UniProtKB/Swiss-Prot annotation, chain B:
Disruption phenotype: Insertion mutants are hypoinvasive in the HEp-2 cell assay. It comes from the Bacteria. The core secretion machinery of the T3SS is composed of approximately 20 different proteins, including cytoplasmic components, a base, an export apparatus and a needle. This subunit is part of the base, which anchors the injectisome in the bacterial cell envelope. Forms a stable homooligomeric complex. The complex is composed of 15 subunits. One of its GO terms (molecular function) is identical protein binding. GO terms for cellular component: cell outer membrane; type II protein secretion system complex; type III protein secretion system complex. Belongs to the bacterial secretin family. T3SS SctC subfamily. GO terms for biological process: protein secretion; protein secretion by the type III secretion system. Component of the type III secretion system (T3SS), also called injectisome, which is used to inject bacterial effector proteins into eukaryotic host cells. Forms a ring-shaped multimeric structure with an apparent central pore in the outer membrane. This is SPI-1 type 3 secretion system secretin. The lineage of its organism: Bacteria, Pseudomonadati, Pseudomonadota, Gammaproteobacteria, Enterobacterales. It is found in: Cell outer membrane. The chain holds residues 32 to 170 of 562 of the full protein. Keywords: Cell outer membrane, Membrane, Protein transport, Signal, Translocation, Transport, Virulence.
Curated annotation (Swiss-Prot), chain D:
This is Protein PrgH. Required for invasion of epithelial cells. The chain holds residues 263 to 391 of 392 of the full protein. It is found in: Cell membrane.
UniProtKB/Swiss-Prot annotation, chain E:
It comes from Salmonella typhimurium (strain LT2 / SGSC1412 / ATCC 700720). The chain holds residues 76 to 150 of 224 of the full protein. It comes from the Bacteria. Belongs to the FliP/MopC/SpaP family. It is found in: Cell membrane. This is Surface presentation of antigens protein SpaP.
Amino acid sequence: KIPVTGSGFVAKDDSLRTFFDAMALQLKEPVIVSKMAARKKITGNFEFHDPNALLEKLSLQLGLIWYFDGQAIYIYDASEMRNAVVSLRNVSLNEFNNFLKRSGLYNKNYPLRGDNRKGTFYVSGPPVYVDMVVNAATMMDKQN
Amino acid sequence: GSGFVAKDDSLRTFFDAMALQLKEPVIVSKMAARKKITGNFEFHDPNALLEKLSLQLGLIWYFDGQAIYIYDASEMRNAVVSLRNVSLNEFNNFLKRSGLYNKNYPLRGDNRKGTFYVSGPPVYVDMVVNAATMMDKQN
Amino acid sequence: KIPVTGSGFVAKDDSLRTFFDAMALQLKEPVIVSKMAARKKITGNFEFHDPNALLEKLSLQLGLIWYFDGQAIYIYDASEMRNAVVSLRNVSLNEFNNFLKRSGLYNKNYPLRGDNRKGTFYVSGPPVYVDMVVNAATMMDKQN
Amino acid sequence: QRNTMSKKELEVLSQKLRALMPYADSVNITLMDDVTAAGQAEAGLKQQALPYSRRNHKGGVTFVIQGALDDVEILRARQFVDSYYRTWGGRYVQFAIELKDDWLKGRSFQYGAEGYIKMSPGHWYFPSP
Amino acid sequence: EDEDVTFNDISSLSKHVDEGLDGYRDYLIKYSDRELVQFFENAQLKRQYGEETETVKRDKDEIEKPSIFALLPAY
């Protein structure tokens, strides 16, 4: 009773929450979509065979930002991007980028802007990335 | 080739359609989201199309390396801030080494002093003031 | 669809914000018109070929004050001009005028009125010019 | 300037056209310039002060009369077209009178190189020419 | 309840309460009458400056927002 024998997801007016969980098995992590980015809708015949490029193309065509932290894929809309400026007292930026490289939380799409061996820099991105980098850079100065 | 046939869009669904040729997401404020546009647009040189439409409609924009912020012209704010123990030529080399240097809205002031005058978009002013008062506290 | 041979702007009951934004391409800077100066209207056939000379003449026929600070052009009406008088305990007026001339905010239509070697002067002009001159004057005595 | 028949080939055309009209005695064939046929149509179209556009191509020309014409301009256009069609016929040059409505009645617009029409204080229209 | 309510400039801090109040204000715009709202700005301006202020028409609606104290009577 089911149609043509290819592979794909047919979307008849879904609402971006029931759509990305269908991609949540080809991506091997669960997907968490925010409330402001769950009001848009999509309709069409889609086909997932490599989803990390499909999410990159749809995040630019629909207008979205996303972050994969190793255990889930958070998805926000572009009007939720926050930024902050934080100054480090007792540790440098390269000794903080080695913590991000060794921990696997480093993201090349939203890097850290600042002088290479100083205390002040500039972050911007999704709120789960900014709330992680601010608190993980403040809690290292109270160690040192 | 490509393009976009706009029919009574609202400047938030338009600059998102431009956000594929531009390789960054675009965050247009909600005071610049009430103006509307229509017409057949062709995207073959987008960084100059955004520069032309910002002057014909009256808009200000800024690209910090991760996204493109877009405000309306009546939201531009300005400030004057004093550095107690750091020169302007050193802070401007910090901005040149970071990547936040915008030649459209530079820093007006004397070359070896502590006072200058800055003006532009609210995400650029509130970054320069906070990164200047966080460089007087370190010294 | 728009048959006229030459180049120019035709305004039918324009309300001084849509009129100056059309001049904001011949002028290469964005124009910011105030709230009280946007209730006046203008209609007629205009053309722009040296708008820095056209803006001075229309700011006297309509009654306006304008200021260009290197990034934008601010336009207020005539009844919003404000005045100030400030005292400098340890720098001169000729020292402050070298800061304004060297930086690039010195305006020869609204000069600074005061004695050449004192601490007191008298400044008057547009509301974005006065609150900058006062704020830099009270931010150089506390620095020195 | 469009046919290359000889003298004999024009005489056999006259003798095969005389057989078609039994009342006539002899058909006289004259050759006219192709340039003055489209020159008198433009010299008469400029004298009446009508907006027009000429599209030259091979094997005939065409004139397009567009715009929101008023009442006396569509009386002079018919008085000129029906007096030109009697003289020359519609095999070479053809007029195309189409009238539309004006968008820019109460609107403010910028003309010239980068033209646009502000349909409203918060609405821009960018036409593609 | 945002921890960054406090700004560093006097006009941006007054801008913040406007963009906080905009979600209530456009609700007043959607459900109030057109001309009854339009009557109060003309009635308040001639009190404000005098009779010489020229009247505003319907065509403001595309760009300009009224005050919060001229809405809720006509609402």
